[PDB]
Design a protein around this ligand. Structure first.
Ligand code: MG
Ligand code: MG
Length: 540
DNA sequence: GCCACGGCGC
DNA sequence: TCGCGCCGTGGC
């Protein structure tokens, strides 16, 4: 029968819990329960009952750990069947989906969530038997990383609220300028944020050619690609593109941020998820750091809003060209390995191979071509796309791509080898054995198959880079704790720390060493490090 | 409020 | 022709 016993539960019990909202730093803990041997213990008062647990063990353990940290408790996350499920198949991203797939039901009751957690753990543990690489990732990466991510989310980061107000005003003033010019050209006002109203203005009123159509609704598209053709010829088009860029930035990364400053901490608590992506990269939300513009002065001015506490400094560490380094390692291409061992400017050096010239004779446009292919090769960038990117003819783009593979032939071979592995086994894997299933390599529709192919050889590269970072995070954490420093943010191939100004230089030196030495590859791992009062200044 | 949707950032 | 999360729109 359904066994119940009073709170507190025995040691090693799985926990279940219900939040008032999904963000643990912002939620009330409504209910707390634990289960062992299928026997459920329900906490009369959940906040007091947290004190009784030595560990958060169960579904979404990291999230409960974040809320306990907020409350001044140290409840480190342990086993979590979500992490097992994600290793079995990274399409496993939510408790609901995991329950549906492997058994049971994700409900809204803490006791049931606790019992479910225990059953799923045993189930998924059994399904992993013999999978030694995935089990190594669980023990050395996923479980210990969950505790690091709890601390990052709970600690949060200070924002420069005066600066954000100044930036908001500047962007608002530019937006106002552009809409007035658009309304001047259209001869009347309308909602520039409405694609339906803009469609009418551009194509019916102004009579512009309508190239493409929308995916579902079957209307004339007003997308960037469709307007690109019209840009040079029609001023109103250019103004709309500028307008869209600024309003996207404002509404996503300027307007939301102060409301995310918690009343209790005086900090922004970015949420970090380790079971959200197909590749094994971490994701962030509230805000999504990954989608902050990387080019443009505007992306950079968002980062200036992120600041150190008074008396402290931010330390920013970035793995230079890590995906390309991983490609050199996985492919074993001797010439690409030479590019990295010569150890001068990587894109200049890549260009010298491609074009057959001494590095001194590589000009900035040749370098840009190499740099662009060094990014694009990783996912099969088309020659059409390269020709757009470089503003050169299609045939010349094709030639550049072939020049690249001629210099780096084992990269060409590795891509095909990886596709054969995917076709044979149904999955591809990273250096560490993180696995993604790739069923549509067999697809009949060429377009679907070719996207499947691109996802298939890109994942081992991105996923290896992801796990190198996560291992470094695991290794670095205890070394920072003992200096009074901490990790705050992770995005792309970058890690942002906060340290007291007196310890900042030593922390930079320690973190660089830990990151560069995390795992041996056929080429060196290189880390760029900078220190500053704000995140933009710490890029250096 | 819910949803699907276009559009765009990485 | 370069999947997913984000925003605002418009229908209900
Ligand atoms: Mg959509
Ligand atoms: Mg509405």
């Amino acid at each position: 029968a359904l066994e119940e016993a009073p709170w507190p539960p025995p040691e090693g019990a799985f926990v279940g819990f219900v939040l008032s909202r999904k963000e643990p730093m912002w939620a009330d803990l409504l209910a707390l329960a634990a289960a062992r041997g299928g026997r459920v213990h329900r906490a009369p008062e959940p906040y007091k009952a947290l004190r009784d647990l030595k560990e958060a063990r169960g579904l979404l353990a990291k999230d409960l750990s974040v809320l306990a940290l907020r409350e001044g408790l140290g409840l480190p996350p342990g086993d979590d069947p979500m992490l097992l499920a994600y290793l079995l198949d990274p399409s496993n991203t939510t408790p609901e989906g995991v329950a549906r797939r492997y058994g049971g039901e994700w409900t809204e009751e803490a006791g049931e969530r606790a019992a479910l957690s225990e059953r799923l753990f045993a189930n998924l543990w059994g399904r992993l038997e013999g999978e030694e690489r995935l089990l190594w990732l669980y023990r050395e990466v996923e479980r210990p990383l969950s505790a690091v991510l709890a601390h990052m989310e709970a600690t949060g980061v200070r924002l420069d609220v005066a600066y954000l107000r100044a930036l908001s005003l500047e962007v608002a003033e530019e937006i106002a300028r552009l809409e007035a010019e658009v309304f001047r050209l259209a001869g009347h006002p309308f909602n520039l944020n409405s694609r339906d109203q803009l469609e009418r203005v551009l194509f019916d009123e102004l009579g512009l050619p309508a190239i493409g159509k929308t995916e579902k609704t079957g209307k004339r598209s007003t997308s960037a690609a469709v307007l690109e053709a019209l840009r040079e010829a029609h001023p109103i088009v250019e103004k709309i593109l500028q307008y869209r860029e600024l309003t996207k930035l404002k509404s996503t990364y300027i307007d939301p941020l102060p409301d995310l400053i918690h009343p209790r901490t005086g900090r922004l608590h970015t949420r970090f998820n380790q079971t959200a992506t197909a590749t094994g990269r971490l994701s962030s939300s509230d805000p999504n750091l990954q989608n902050i513009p990387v080019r443009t002065p505007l992306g950079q001015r968002i980062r200036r809003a992120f600041i150190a506490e008074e008396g402290w400094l931010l330390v920013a560490l970035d793995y230079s060209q890590i995906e390309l380094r991983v490609l050199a390692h996985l492919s074993g291409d001797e010439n690409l390995i030479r590019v990295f061992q010569e150890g001068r400017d990587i894109h200049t050096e890549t260009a010298s191979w491609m074009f057959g010239v001494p590095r001194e004779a590589v000009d900035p446009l040749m370098r840009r071509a190499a740099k662009t292919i060094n990014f694009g090769v990783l996912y099969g960038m088309s020659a059409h796309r390269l020709s757009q990117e470089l503003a050169i003819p299609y045939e010349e783009a094709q030639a550049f791509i072939e020049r690249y593979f001629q210099s780096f032939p084992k990269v060409r071979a590795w891509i095909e080898k990886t596709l054969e592995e995917g076709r044979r086994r149904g999955y591809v894997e990273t250096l560490f054995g993180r696995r993604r299933y790739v069923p549509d390599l067999e697809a009949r529709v060429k377009s679907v198959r070719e996207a499947a192919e691109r996802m298939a050889f890109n994942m081992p590269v991105q996923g290896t880079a992801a796990d190198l970072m996560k291992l470094a995070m695991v290794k670095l954490f205890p070394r920072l704790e003992e200096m009074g420093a901490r990790m705050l943010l992770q995005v792309h191939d970058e890690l942002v720390l906060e340290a007291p100004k007196e310890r900042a230089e030593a922390v930079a030196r320690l973190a660089k060493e830990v990151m560069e030495g995390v795992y041996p590859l056929a080429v060196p791992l290189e880390v760029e490090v900078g220190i500053g009062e704000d995140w933009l200044s710490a890029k250096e």
